[PDB]
Ligand binder design. Structure first.
Ligand SMILES: [Cl-]
Ligand SMILES: [Cl-]
Ligand SMILES: [Cl-]
Ligand SMILES: [Cl-]
Ligand SMILES: [Cl-]
Ligand SMILES: [Cl-]
Ligand SMILES: [Cl-]
Ligand SMILES: [Cl-]
Ligand SMILES: [Cl-]
Ligand SMILES: [Cl-]
Ligand SMILES: [Cl-]
Ligand SMILES: [Zn+2]
Ligand SMILES: [Zn+2]
Ligand SMILES: [Zn+2]
Ligand SMILES: [Zn+2]
Length: 129
């Protein structure tokens, strides 16, 4: 789970930002280190953060929860889905699936001491098209 006191924007970066692609089994170790149990599924976006925060500028659309703070990407990007196939921590073994799809992020204003560069930042990944 997201550590107490960490912002949602910062968590989003840890969980999903992977500008240079990494193998799932390596990359999922840093996702799995807070619970030290194997996360079942995770998607990594192979884009610079600034390009994902730029998506917060597209027209507002409904998230999966019904709230109108989601935003679709301008275009498809490279991303990797990781899916747990076996193991127990620290042996979380994943099957990867590399894809080129658009995505939808939920966005909110930055909080606390988040950077001031972006007036809306991604706080969670809402869907992959
Ligand atoms: Cl997240
Ligand atoms: Cl951390
Ligand atoms: Cl940590
Ligand atoms: Cl995910
Ligand atoms: Cl990043
Ligand atoms: Cl949602
Ligand atoms: Cl709400
Ligand atoms: Cl293509
Ligand atoms: Cl998420
Ligand atoms: Cl969601
Ligand atoms: Cl989805
Ligand atoms: Zn940590
Ligand atoms: Zn709401
Ligand atoms: Zn997430
Ligand atoms: Zn959502």
């Amino acid at each position: 789970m997201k550590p107490k006191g960490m912002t949602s924007s910062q968590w989003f970066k840890i969980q999903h930002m992977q500008p240079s692609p990494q193998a799932c089994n390596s990359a999922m170790k840093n996702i799995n280190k807070h619970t030290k149990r194997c996360k079942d599924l995770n998607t990594f976006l192979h884009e610079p953060f600034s390009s994902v925060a730029a998506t917060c500028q597209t027209p507002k659309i409904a998230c999966k929860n019904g709230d109108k703070n989601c935003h679709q990407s301008h275009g498809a990007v490279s991303l990797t889905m990781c899916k747990l196939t076996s193991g127990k921590h620290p042996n979380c073994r994943y099957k990867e699936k590399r894809q080129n799809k658009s995505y939808v992020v939920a966005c909110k204003p930055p909080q606390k001491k988040d950077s001031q560069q972006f007036h809306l930042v991604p706080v969670h990944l809402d869907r992959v098209l």
